[PDB]
């Protein structure tokens, strides 16, 4: 079952620090952990709503990797590699 809470409590507190110690931050306040689950559910909504629209155009029911490489390209963040 995709329990709503479980899916977002999936980005756990240790991995919201180790994804931030790769940027330089030395001390992290307690409330950063809540806001940073908010900004990764309003980014995935926008990338996974423009991969569904291309998938429907070709009358397919599987979201292929090339479609995500074409959803990201439109919004200004091209990804080179996991696609062609």
């Amino acid at each position: 079952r995709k329990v709503l809470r479980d899916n977002i409590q999936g980005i756990t507190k240790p991995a919201i620090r180790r994804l931030a110690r790769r940027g330089g931050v030395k001390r992290i306040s307690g409330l950063i952990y809540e806001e940073t689950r908010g900004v990764l559910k309003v980014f995935l909504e926008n990338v996974i709503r423009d991969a569904v629209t291309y998938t429907e155009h070709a009358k397919r029911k599987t979201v292929t990797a090339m479609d995500v490489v074409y959803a990201l390209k439109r919004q200004g963040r091209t990804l080179y590699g996991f696609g062609g």
């Binding site: 790769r22 940027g23 330089g24 030395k26 200004g76 963040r77 091209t78 990804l79 080179y80 590699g81 996991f82």
Partner: protein, 120 residues
């Protein structure tokens, strides 16, 4: 009759294909009639730029003591340059990494910190 022939690329001495950048420039509907002096110019600008991701990367593989140009060695060569980080400046490279940088103010230098029982 009609003779025997050789590749158009060799005639102009360019390694990158000059007969495949003509089909891909005409079957993409970029323009109605492609000049025949344009496939050759555009198979040289790509080749000059290919060496800019094949030489700066290789020189950064010897420095880490390895004989293959793996995906990270590509970032340490397109993020350490000033005219190749202003072209590929939004692209994210798969399984790459970040360039090492720690801002100076954070580095340990509180000098005893102070405010404690007079260390005097």
């Amino acid at each position: 009759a009609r003779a025997k022939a050789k590749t158009r690329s060799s005639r102009a001495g360019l390694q990158f294909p000059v007969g495949r950048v003509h089909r891909l420039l005409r079957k993409g509907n970029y323009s109605e009639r492609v000049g025949a002096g344009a496939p050759v110019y555009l198979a040289a600008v790509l080749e000059y730029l290919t060496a800019e991701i094949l030489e700066l990367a290789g020189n950064a593989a010897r420095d880490n003591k390895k004989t293959r140009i793996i995906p990270r060695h590509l970032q340490l060569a397109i993020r350490n340059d000033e005219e190749l980080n202003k072209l590929l400046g939004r692209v994210t490279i798969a399984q790459g990494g970040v360039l090492p940088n720690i801002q100076a103010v954070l580095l340990p230098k509180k000098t005893e910190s102070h405010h404690k029982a007079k260390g005097k």
